[PDB]
Amino acid sequence: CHPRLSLHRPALEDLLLGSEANLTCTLTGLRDASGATFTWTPSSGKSAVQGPPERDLCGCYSVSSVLPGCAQPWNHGETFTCTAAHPELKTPLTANITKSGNTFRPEVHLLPPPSEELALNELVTLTCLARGFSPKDVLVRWLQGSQELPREKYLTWASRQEPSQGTTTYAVTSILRVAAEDWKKGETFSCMVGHEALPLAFTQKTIDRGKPTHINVSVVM
Amino acid sequence: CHPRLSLHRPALEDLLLGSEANLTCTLTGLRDASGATFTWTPSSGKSAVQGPPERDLCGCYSVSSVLPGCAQPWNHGETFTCTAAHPELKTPLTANITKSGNTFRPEVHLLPPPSEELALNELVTLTCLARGFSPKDVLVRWLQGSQELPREKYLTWASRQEPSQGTTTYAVTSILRVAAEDWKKGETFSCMVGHEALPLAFTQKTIDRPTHINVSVVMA
Amino acid sequence: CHPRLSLHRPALEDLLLGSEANLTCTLTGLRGATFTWTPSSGKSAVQGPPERDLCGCYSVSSVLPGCAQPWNHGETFTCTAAHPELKTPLTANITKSGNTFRPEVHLLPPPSEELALNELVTLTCLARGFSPKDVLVRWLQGSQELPREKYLTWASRQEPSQGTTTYAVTSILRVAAEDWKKGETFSCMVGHEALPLAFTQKTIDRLAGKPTHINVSVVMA
Ligand SMILES: *[C@@H]1O[C@H](CO)[C@@H](O)[C@H](O)[C@H]1NC(C)=O
């Protein structure tokens, strides 16, 4: 029962919303000495910060390695490297990370409300569904008109892997509940999806009251 | 480290299409290798369940104490207390379990496939929603025709506490990918929603595949 | 013959798409020179390798790169020059804009007089009422982003109100009639500094211009 080292990726919210990029390197498990020598093999000057004295169960002392400024080298195709050596673990070990290939673009649907509650006039559901993208990293946001709703007025599941033929694609869902007065009045809403395979980082679908046309023809003798 | 105590519940996956009766309360923290029944309260149907597990290490153990009597005391809110006294305990570790009610019922809707997804005719998508009640676990099976499918052609998420006003409620969804021409031949599909607020613990719903032209002729 | 100094805000196509965002100070003269930047930022600049303009004085530029987070953070930048023909050093400065406004985007359906000739249909995108005058416009078909050589966008003029100062811009895209009658969908995207998620999208297809009900009556009397 002892862990080995591996390397995470930058967060997609930070990488897409324009702010920054980090890169984390972790080992843990036992409350031992602060000779946790983290060393980064590529480093443009501003090297890492040996992070805060974090604790885990039965005093499992975790400290990490985090470096700022990792947008352009991660995005154009570098190959980063983290190595470490400990007082207890004086035998050094190394992990690698690489930005993935073999990408597919998502497909996003928004679906109208449920005739059963369309008659009830209490609350309506709008469900957003995305399907068929290559890494398991997405964003979902909802809007109304031009105003962004807060992140507490809906719920979203995690991205499961779908089982189908050959390759491994993913999917994720979310639902939104809104009262009926504005829905029958004519207010509109939107579902946005962020993913790193789209060329402009985002797509957006909107829905509103999809009905067919009426035709009345009458002959009077 | 820590010998612990934590609150558990009978796993309700075995009361709808299951015929057995166990309790679902494993070790609270730590013990040693034993024959999985430590003595509780009941002199009520002494038909005690058993089974010897192997030995475990790395801090904890893999040893429970399971005792029967599940669906027969399932009327009026009785407690069942997980007991285990193996010599790492500095006191007899009589745990406790409290069962609340206020069980609410699913509101299952279904809905057509998306409109612009049917200009390519590769596959067909249907989604099945199930929302709004106080307990946690729900099951689901998909069927084409009338007989229920195995667990190798659908996908189902977990259940989250939905953001609602006033109440404490949940939700769960699941999707289905079938072919185009089989949907085009008028085949029908249903999802079953099994919960313990339903009278018979099943629910179904299914639609399938419109102009509004009306002509009227009156005289004089 | 005459000396001059300038700065420039970073371009929006680099602030929004790929974050390597420059910041340019020019000097137009030398009819040899050193530049100084008051925020330190570690990484020094590069001088222009000094082309000429307007049949006269050969200008010289210098570009401080890697300033994408202090631009959005609200910081201030000044660059100070020096030259033999200058008595005093010249200085200038640049800040991010305050009191912004976000745009309103509309996508209009084609005129019905156009569908009777079976050649090409015309889509129109309009964005109106945004306070800093810089913007981007991109078109799509389904998910495929179209190349830039297939449409036409105008510049960003100033619109005549009395309240504040605001701006507007248009764009057209002409697609084929056979692809319009099949049910292909098309989209318009706008990027602005003052939008919260940096992009907004509107779409269209062969429905949604059709009327909701038709009443015909023929009277044989
Ligand atoms: C810097 O910019 C301000 C406006 O923000 C201007 O008033 C001033 O003249 C500039 N130059 C300085 C402080 O040298």
DSSP line for A98-134: ---------EEEEE----HHHHH-S-EEEEEEEE--S
C45 half-sphere exposure, CB direction, 13 A CA radius: 22
Q: Given the DSSP bridges, would you call strands B160-161 and B170-179 parallel, antiparallel or unpaired?
A: antiparallel
Q: Given the DSSP bridges, would you call strands C144-145 and A170-178 parallel, antiparallel or unpaired?
A: unpaired
Residue B21: alpha-carbon gap to chain centroid: 16
Residue type, C7: L
Cβ-contact A48, A42 below 8 angstroms: no
Partners of B116 on chain C (C-beta within 8 Å) are 183, 185, 205
- Full set of structural domains in chain A with CATH: 1-98 (no CATH), 99-221 (2.60.40.10)
Residue C171 bridge partners (DSSP)? C125, C153
Say how many C-beta atoms besides its own lie within 10 A of residue B172's C-beta: 22
Are A18 and C15 within 8 A, CB to CB?
yes
- Chains touching chain C through at least 3 C-beta pairs below 8 angstroms are A, B
Are A214 and C217 within 8 A, CB to CB?
no
Length of chain A equals 221
Nearest CA in chain C to A217: C216
Strand order from edge to edge, sheet including C59-63: C5-6, C24-28, C59-63, C46-47
DSSP string, C95-123: ----S----EEEEEPPPTTTTTS-SEEEE
Place of tokens 């509940």: A177
Cβ-contact C132, C193 below 8 angstroms: yes
The alpha carbon of C93 and the centre of ligand 1 are apart by a number of angstroms equal to: 6
List, comma-separated, the residues after which chain B is broken, a break being a C to N distance over 2.5 A; otherwise answer none. Answer: 209
Are C182 and B119 within 8 A, CB to CB?
yes
The alpha carbon of A15 and the centre of ligand 1 are apart by a number of angstroms equal to: 33
Among the partner-chain residues A200, A219, A220, the one whose CB lies closest to the CB of C138 is A200
Partners of A110 on chain C (C-beta within 8 Å) are none
User: B77-95 burial, b for 16+ CB within 10 Å, e for fewer?
Assistant: eeebebbbebeeeeeebee
Contacts of B207 (CB under 8 A, 6+ apart): B110, B112
- Chains touching chain B through at least 3 C-beta pairs below 8 angstroms are A, C
The alpha carbon of C75 and the centre of ligand 1 are apart by a number of angstroms equal to: 13
- Taking the C-alpha atoms of residue C107 and residue C127, their distance in angstroms, rounded to an integer, is 9
Contacts of C148 (CB under 8 A, 6+ apart): none
Closest Cα of chain B to A153: distance in Å? Answer: 6
Nearest-Å Rg of the Cα atoms of chain B is: 25
Angstrom CA distances, C165 to A58, B209, C99, C158, C190, stand at 63, 53, 11, 7, 20
User: What is the H or E stretch that residue C155 is in?
Assistant: none
Burial class, B170, CB count within 10 angstroms (exposed 0-12 / middle 13-18 / buried 19+): buried
B 110-169: CB under 8 A from C = 116, 119
Name all residues whose Cβ lies below 6 A of ligand 1. C 91, 93, 95
Classified as helix, coil or strand, A27 is strand
State which of C25, C80, C93 you would mutate to test the pocket of ligand 1, scoring each by most atoms of that ligand within 8 A of its C-beta.
Answer: C93
Angstrom CA distances, A106 to A9, A133, B118, C191, stand at 21, 5, 17, 21
Structural biology method used: cryo-EM
Quick check: C185 contacting B, CB < 8 Å? yes
Closest C-alpha to ligand 1, atom 6: C93
Place of tokens 């612009």: B116
Partners of B117 on chain C (C-beta within 8 Å) are none
The alpha carbon of A44 and the centre of ligand 1 are apart by a number of angstroms equal to: 34
Closest C-alpha to ligand 1, atom 8: C93
Q: Note the resolution in Å, 1 decimal.
A: 3.0
Classified as helix, coil or strand, C125 is strand
Closest C-alpha to ligand 1, atom 10: C93
Q: Which of A203, A205, A211 to mutate to test the interface with C (most CBs of C within 10 A)?
A: A203
Burial class, C203, CB count within 10 angstroms (exposed 0-12 / middle 13-18 / buried 19+): middle
Q: Which atom of ligand 1 is nearest to the CA of C94?
A: 2
Are B160 and A163 within 8 A, CB to CB?
no
Are B116 and C182 within 8 A, CB to CB?
no
The single-letter DSSP state of residue C54 is T
Cβ-contact B123, B92 below 8 angstroms: no
Cβ-contact C210, A213 below 8 angstroms: yes
The alpha carbon of A170 and the centre of ligand 1 are apart by a number of angstroms equal to: 53
DSSP string, chain B: -----------GGGSSS----------SS------S----S--S-------------SSS----------STT-SS----------TT-SS-----------------EE-PPPSGGGSS-SEEEEEEEEE--SS---EEEEEETTEEP-TTS-EE---EE---SSS--EEEEEEEEEEHHHHHTT--EEEEEE-TTSSSS----------EEEEEEE--
Residue A140 bridge partners (DSSP)? A193
Token digits of residue B138? 């729900």
